[PDB]
């Protein structure tokens, strides 16, 4: 549960991709050129240049494999920080595409050199250049014009035509709706880039079931043979119709993305996935998040829900989500909590015995806010009381203190004299977030109760009012 | 406004009285003896012994006058502490009696030596050996058997008989009831002491008017001439029918006792009287009071209601009582206030600017309780608030915080987290009451909210509850 710095493994692979990217550009050209310079009915010394290319392609393909494995070993074995995490996902995506492109080029050269190894049909491939999945989507939202892009890959020469537009299809492999969940599934193709953008409009909930989109188009061969070419499935996702389904759906989605048909995954594999989904829930920036799960949070999680083992099993998840899902529902929907938590105002994930030690003998009125370990989704303010001898006191904030969306958590806070100064979680010189005693009113700085008319002086005033 | 120590003037006069007391005992004997040793029809050398006595009597009488004047000059010119105060009142009372007794003896000897100076009627006198006045009495109370004692004074020889019992009569010189206010007004006389005890039962209110009792009996001369002998009036007092009249009546009584038909009195004369009536209101012991008006209180009074002058006028009183009377009504009737004030829990008489300086920069939650200068009869808690920067805040406690006799002032106090530690008024080594920060709960030690079941541990608890 300690974020590392694979900064090397990844900046190394980043440069390779950019280089390979250009290698592929000059190769699609170099190849097509050789194909048009082929004497009708190949000899031998005709094929020296093709065999040399095939050779380079095979070697290149191998590098790509080593890269992939390296990337795959890193997610499964290292706990990556938000940035390194986001980068890995991007590098993996682009390497897969480069790999497929190189593949369609090799098949084409191989169709010539060693025929009879044909039948691979036309060299075409549909790939997802970019997608907004995974994510839990609210029924009725429509995707941006550049959020979901499909790209068509080809060899040097195209020995076929494309009929009709590219079509999107929603799939739920846990079957068996009775209508159409998507609007704007058919799109035409951009010529300069052979791309199709899909600003989808989600018209139906998924009934808390993971879902994937599939794309396909029809290709008409040079012999008038029509074949359909489809893409692999997109990352999973779910559509909900009310913020009541968020948890259940988000859980299903996370379990799926995390394990993906497996029973056991590595700890790193797990939190790397959780981390990603946590920033999506709290709607934070993936690369520079205001507040991502910290090393402390991860350890808290790893201790309270997992044997503290470096291997996580399928069923351990169910209990984890029963509680963790709730904490995330509150952060995602309860007014100002997300913001308050990201500020350091609400600490969050911390146990009893640790809150107590953190508050071991502080001037009375010192409180730290945190999640109740027994009442999932709710906060427990740990503060020091007035009565002597001063002892530590816990209070479970209830759906009535903030009840009536009118009044909000931050209001409730500034209404009780028992809560004087907060132990806020703030970052230091070396990024170091620590505990600095702000004053309830100072920290709640902007969520403060603005005043109208100035403070009264020489008379009497109402208490706490 | 600074209590002195006339301890000398008074211990001097105390010894004299005790001595004179015995002088009078041996004189009543020495005289009667000479009277029975008088040859029928006085000569001259018959009268040498009577003239020598008369001489001693005149000299003695004079001392008594000097004593009285001395006592009278002391009340009017020195601020006496509770003890010295109580003593003065007692010494004055007994000196008056001794003086009257000596007088009846001198008249008798003078009736002989210089007749024609007779006509003074029979040598008898009714005097109040002890009384419970001044005081505001509640209709329906009955006096103890030794609270109101009348004593009959005589000369050496008694040349008369007493008919019937001694009678009490209530008088209101501010006239013009229509019935009988007293029960058990006629009492017989004790032979060994010629005393009559009057355990009066007050059957009627006075309608907020000072009142005095008069006593009288009928004396039948040796010539069958009947004459009534009455006593001077008792100290003033009032009878009330409901704790609604206490103030008005107590005020009337205090003004009367203080000024007694005058327009201007001395400051000392005033507070000496107030002090006495204050201890009566708070029902405290007159000699060793738990908490009498202090030097500070007196100064506060002298500054806020009197020009700070050493002379007090009649009308200045009216405003003084409008406010002071209320403070005393609260101390006398509001549940636990008397006790709380006598403990040091409630400071009491203190102004704004002084409470502020007393609280100049103390840890927040520090409060001192005191009387509101603008809302007579009510308290104003001056405390330090939570909000930063911490400033001093005043709160007027209202008849709803303690409303419902069920809930009481001390309850209200321990219910607000704004009131953490009290600045109690406690006495030091050299009797020195100062300000020592107790903890709200510590000071309210016995008025504390006792608990049933022990303090809860590892769970959550309600706030302030």
From Swiss-Prot, chains A, B:
<keyword id="KW-0539">Nucleus</keyword>
<keyword id="KW-0238">DNA-binding</keyword>
<keyword id="KW-0678">Repressor</keyword>
<comment type="subunit">
    <text>Monomer, in the absence of tyrosine phosphorylation. Homodimer, or heterodimer with another family member, when tyrosine phosphorylated.</text>
</comment>
<feature type="site" description="Interaction with DNA">
    <location>
        <position position="142"/>
    </location>
</feature>
<keyword id="KW-0963">Cytoplasm</keyword>
<dbReference type="GO" id="GO:0007259">
    <property type="term" value="P:cell surface receptor signaling pathway via JAK-STAT"/>
</dbReference>
<comment type="similarity">
    <text>Belongs to the transcription factor STAT family.</text>
</comment>
<dbReference type="GO" id="GO:0010468">
    <property type="term" value="P:regulation of gene expression"/>
</dbReference>
<dbReference type="GO" id="GO:0031149">
    <property type="term" value="P:sorocarp stalk cell differentiation"/>
</dbReference>
<dbReference type="GO" id="GO:0003677">
    <property type="term" value="F:DNA binding"/>
</dbReference>
<keyword id="KW-0805">Transcription regulation</keyword>
<keyword id="KW-0175">Coiled coil</keyword>
<feature type="domain" description="SH2">
    <location>
        <begin position="341"/>
        <end position="444"/>
    </location>
</feature>
<keyword id="KW-0597">Phosphoprotein</keyword>
<feature type="site" description="Interaction with DNA">
    <location>
        <position position="335"/>
    </location>
</feature>
<dbReference type="GO" id="GO:0030587">
    <property type="term" value="P:sorocarp development"/>
</dbReference>
<keyword id="KW-0727">SH2 domain</keyword>
<protein>
    <recommendedName>
        <fullName>Signal transducer and activator of transcription A</fullName>
    </recommendedName>
</protein>
<keyword id="KW-0804">Transcription</keyword>
<feature type="coiled-coil region">
    <location>
        <begin position="4"/>
        <end position="118"/>
    </location>
</feature>
<dbReference type="GO" id="GO:0010628">
    <property type="term" value="P:positive regulation of gene expression"/>
</dbReference>
<dbReference type="GO" id="GO:0000981">
    <property type="term" value="F:DNA-binding transcription factor activity, RNA polymerase II-specific"/>
</dbReference>
<dbReference type="GO" id="GO:0006952">
    <property type="term" value="P:defense response"/>
</dbReference>
<comment type="function">
    <text>Transcription factor that binds to 5'-TTGAATTGA-3' elements in the promoter region of target genes. Functions as a repressor of the ecmB gene. Regulates the differentiation of prestalk cells during development.</text>
</comment>
<dbReference type="GO" id="GO:0031154">
    <property type="term" value="P:culmination involved in sorocarp development"/>
</dbReference>
<dbReference type="GO" id="GO:0005737">
    <property type="term" value="C:cytoplasm"/>
</dbReference>
<dbReference type="GO" id="GO:0006357">
    <property type="term" value="P:regulation of transcription by RNA polymerase II"/>
</dbReference>
<feature type="modified residue" description="Phosphotyrosine">
    <location>
        <position position="460"/>
    </location>
</feature>
<feature type="DNA-binding region">
    <location>
        <begin position="201"/>
        <end position="245"/>
    </location>
</feature>
<dbReference type="GO" id="GO:0005829">
    <property type="term" value="C:cytosol"/>
</dbReference>
<dbReference type="GO" id="GO:0045892">
    <property type="term" value="P:negative regulation of DNA-templated transcription"/>
</dbReference>
<dbReference type="GO" id="GO:0042802">
    <property type="term" value="F:identical protein binding"/>
</dbReference>
<dbReference type="GO" id="GO:0005634">
    <property type="term" value="C:nucleus"/>
</dbReference>
<dbReference type="GO" id="GO:0097696">
    <property type="term" value="P:cell surface receptor signaling pathway via STAT"/>
</dbReference>
<dbReference type="GO" id="GO:0042127">
    <property type="term" value="P:regulation of cell population proliferation"/>
</dbReference>
<dbReference type="GO" id="GO:0000978">
    <property type="term" value="F:RNA polymerase II cis-regulatory region sequence-specific DNA binding"/>
</dbReference>
């Amino acid at each position: 549960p300690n974020l590392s710095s694979p900064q090397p493994i990844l900046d190394t692979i980043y440069k390779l991709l950019s280089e390979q990217e250009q290698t592929l550009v000059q190769m699609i050209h170099e190849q097509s050129l050789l194909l048009n310079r082929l004497p009708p009915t190949l000899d031998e010394n005709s094929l020296a240049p093709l065999k040399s290319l095939s050779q380079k392609q095979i070697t290149l393909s191998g590098q790509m494999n080593t890269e992939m494995s390296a990337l795959d070993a890193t997610k499964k074995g290292m706990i990556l920080e938000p940035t390194d995490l986001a980068k890995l996902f991007a590098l993996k995506q682009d390497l897969q595409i480069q790999f497929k492109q190189l593949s369609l080029l090799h098949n084409e050269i191989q169709s010539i050199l060693n025929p009879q190894h044909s039948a691979p049909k036309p060299n075409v491939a549909l790939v997802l250049k970019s997608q907004p999945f995974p994510v839990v989507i609210s029924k009725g939202k429509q995707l941006g014009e550049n959020q979901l892009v499909v790209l068509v890959l080809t060899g040097a020469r195209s020995n076929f035509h494309i009929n009709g537009p590219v079509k999107a299809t929603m799939i739920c492999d846990s079957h068996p709706n009775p209508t159409t969940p998507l609007e704007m599934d058919s799109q035409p193709i951009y010529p300069a880039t052979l791309t199709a953008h899909f600003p989808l409009k989600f018209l139906a909930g998924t009934r808390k079931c993971s879902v994937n989109l599939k794309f396909g188009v029809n290709i008409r061969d040079l012999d008038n043979v029509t074949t359909t070419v489809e893409s692999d499935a997109s990352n999973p996702f779910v559509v909900i119709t009310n913020e009541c389904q968020w948890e259940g759906s988000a859980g299903v989605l996370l379990k799926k993305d995390a394990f993906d048909g497996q029973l056991e995954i590595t700890w790193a594999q797990f939190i790397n996935t959780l981390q990603r989904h946590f920033l999506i829930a709290t709607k934070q920036d993936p690369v520079r998040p205001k507040r991502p799960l910290s090393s402390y949070d991860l350890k808290y999680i790893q201790t309270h829900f997992f044997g503290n083992r470096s291997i996580i099993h399928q069923q351990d998840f169910d209990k984890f989500w029963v509680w963790f899902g709730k904490s995330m529902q509150t952060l995602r929907y309860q007014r100002h909590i997300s913001t308050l938590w990201q500020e350091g105002i609400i600490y969050g994930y911390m146990g009893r015995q640790e809150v107590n030690d953190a508050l071991q003998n502080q001037d009375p009125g010192t409180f730290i806010i945190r999640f109740s370990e027994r009442n999932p989704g709710q906060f427990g303010i740990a503060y020091i009381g007035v009565e002597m001898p001063a002892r530590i006191k816990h209070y479970l904030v209830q759906p009535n203190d903030t009840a009536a969306a009118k009044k909000t958590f931050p209001d409730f806070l500034s209404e009780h004299s028992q809560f004087v100064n907060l132990l806020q979680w703030t970052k230091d010189t070396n990024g170091a977030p620590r505990f600095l005693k702000l004053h309830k009113d100072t920290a709640l700085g902007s969520f403060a109760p603005k005043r109208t008319a100035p403070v009264p002086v020489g008379g009497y005033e109402p208490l706490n009012s």
